[PDB]
Structure formats: C-alpha cells, structure tokens
Write an enzyme that holds these catalytic residues in place. Structure first.
Site, short mmCIF file in Angstrom:
data_model
loop_
_atom_site.label_atom_id
_atom_site.label_comp_id
_atom_site.label_asym_id
_atom_site.label_seq_id
_atom_site.Cartn_x
_atom_site.Cartn_y
_atom_site.Cartn_z
N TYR A 229 -10.49 13.38 -0.50
CA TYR A 229 -10.07 12.90 -1.81
C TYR A 229 -11.03 13.37 -2.89
CZ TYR A 229 -7.89 9.34 1.16
OH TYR A 229 -7.16 8.70 2.12
N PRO B 233 -4.20 6.44 12.00
CA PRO B 233 -3.10 7.40 11.94
C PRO B 233 -3.57 8.65 11.19
CG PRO B 233 -2.32 5.22 11.47
CD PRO B 233 -3.81 5.16 11.40
N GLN C 83 -13.64 11.02 6.54
CA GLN C 83 -12.96 10.99 5.27
C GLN C 83 -14.04 11.44 4.30
OE1 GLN C 83 -11.89 7.10 4.20
NE2 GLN C 83 -9.70 7.41 4.51
N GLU D 28 -2.15 6.45 -5.68
CA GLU D 28 -2.18 5.46 -4.63
C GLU D 28 -2.22 4.11 -5.30
OE1 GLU D 28 -4.69 3.11 -4.22
OE2 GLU D 28 -4.80 2.59 -2.09
N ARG E 143 -13.30 7.17 10.43
CA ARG E 143 -12.12 6.35 10.68
C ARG E 143 -11.86 6.51 12.17
NH1 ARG E 143 -10.11 3.18 7.82
NH2 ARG E 143 -7.96 4.01 7.87
N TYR F 166 -5.61 14.98 -2.99
CA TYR F 166 -5.67 14.42 -1.63
C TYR F 166 -5.11 15.41 -0.62
CZ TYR F 166 -3.75 11.51 2.20
OH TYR F 166 -3.41 10.95 3.41
N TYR G 290 -5.65 4.43 -7.45
CA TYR G 290 -6.43 5.61 -7.80
C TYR G 290 -5.58 6.87 -7.93
CZ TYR G 290 -6.85 6.37 -2.72
OH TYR G 290 -6.55 6.53 -1.38
N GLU H 270 -9.73 14.08 6.28
CA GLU H 270 -8.86 13.58 5.22
C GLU H 270 -9.78 13.55 4.01
OE1 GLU H 270 -7.84 9.42 5.35
OE2 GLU H 270 -5.84 9.85 4.60
N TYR I 88 -1.60 19.98 3.98
CA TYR I 88 -1.14 19.75 2.60
C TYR I 88 -2.27 19.43 1.63
CZ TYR I 88 -0.76 14.61 3.47
OH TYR I 88 -0.89 13.28 3.74
N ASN J 295 0.86 -1.17 0.00
CA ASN J 295 0.00 0.00 0.00
C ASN J 295 0.91 1.26 0.00
OD1 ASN J 295 -2.12 1.48 2.54
ND2 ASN J 295 -2.24 1.68 0.31
#
Length: 190
Positions: free
Chosen positions: A88, A126, A136, A177, A122, A77, A73, A86, A171, A44
């Site tokens: 996308y 992390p 997400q 990915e 989630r 991000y 994908y 997070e 960021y 991953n």
C-alpha cells in the site's frame, strides 16, 4: 455501472471490488479510469481501478474527490508473487492511520512528500494464491492529498533498500477502502 463484488476490465482499466458482505456500500465503474464509491455504515470493503498486471516503474495519476466520514483510506494497492507481498502507498486516510501496529523501517521522499515505511506479517490470511503467510508493506504519506501522481519506483526502490525484493507484479490499483464507516469518493486513474 454499479456492480456486486468482482474483478475485470472496464473502459480500459482493470478493477477489483471486494466487500465482507455487510452491506452499506455501492461501487460504480465509471468512464475511463473512473470509479465511485458511496458508503453508509458499511462493513469492510476495498475497491478501485488500475492495471493487471502492474509494473515496477509505473507512474500513477489519480484525481477526484475523497470524502471519508470515519475509518477509511485512499491508496495505490497491489500484490507481488515470489515473494508474496501485499503493498500500500497511502495518500490519504480518514480517522485511523492504517499503518498503526506495523513496524517502521524507514522513510522515503517521493512526489512532494516524505513517506514513512512500515511492514507487518500476516499469518494464514487470504491472499491472491489462497490462505498464506506474507508481509504487508506500507508507505504512508505525511502530507495527505486526494489528487496527484505516484512514482511507484521510488517506493519499490526504498523498500528494496530495506530488504524487500519484489518479484512478479500482480494487480496494481488506486483503491478506496472503508472500515465500518461512511463516506463517498469519485476517483479517476490514469
């Protein structure tokens, strides 16, 4: 240059490259906003270029070649803090739709295509601030493409009308990915 996982700025652009340690991925920072990823029976990983910090109205341009051989994908991000999110904006994907299992909130039209909006929580995962619990957000493009322009404001506004209030932008990159697959990509961000 070809680097081990890490972050920083290269040729004017922020970059972030992370992998699970599995092996089978080669990430290379190229001229200007370009980055290349070549993977074969990888684990991953996520890597790309953009800005740190990003903004809520940035219009992002990307072009290049995206040739996934399996699960992978291509997406804008990034992260937000207060609230910790997070997100996308998926422009293209291989064999698996990454939003699978997420809850559909609505749809938005932007840059020549309709996007389906999803959200998923989630727990104790992390994050940029450590082990935390966060949502997400996903915007998944119906008409897949490997080059174009993404007007991030259209997505943030749509997400806001669905209850998402972004706070401090961290960021914001255009990333490739891969998930236990193979492939190659050469993308240029501007």
């Amino acid at each position: 240059q070809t680097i081990q996982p890490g972050t920083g700025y290269n040729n004017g652009y922020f970059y972030s490259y992370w992998n699970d340690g599995h092996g089978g991925v080669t990430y290379t920072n190229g001229p200007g906003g370009q980055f290349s990823v070549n993977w074969s029976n990888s684990g991953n990983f996520v890597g790309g270029k953009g800005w740190q910090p990003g903004t809520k109205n940035k219009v992002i341009n990307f072009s290049g070649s995206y040739n996934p051989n399996g699960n992978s994908y291509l997406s804008v991000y990034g992260w937000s803090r207060n609230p910790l999110i997070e997100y996308y904006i998926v422009e293209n994907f291989g064999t698996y739709n990454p939003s699978t299992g997420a809850t559909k909130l609505g749809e938005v039209t932007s840059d020549g295509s309709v996007y389906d909006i999803y959200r998923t929580q989630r727990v104790n995962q992390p994050s940029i601030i450590g082990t935390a619990t966060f949502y997400q957000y996903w915007s998944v493009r119906r008409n897949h493409r490997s080059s174009g322009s993404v007007n991030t404001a259209n997505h943030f506004n749509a997400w806001a009308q669905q209850g998402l209030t972004l706070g401090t932008m961290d960021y914001q990159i255009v990333a490739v990915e891969g998930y236990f697959s193979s492939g190659s990509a050469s993308i240029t961000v501007s």
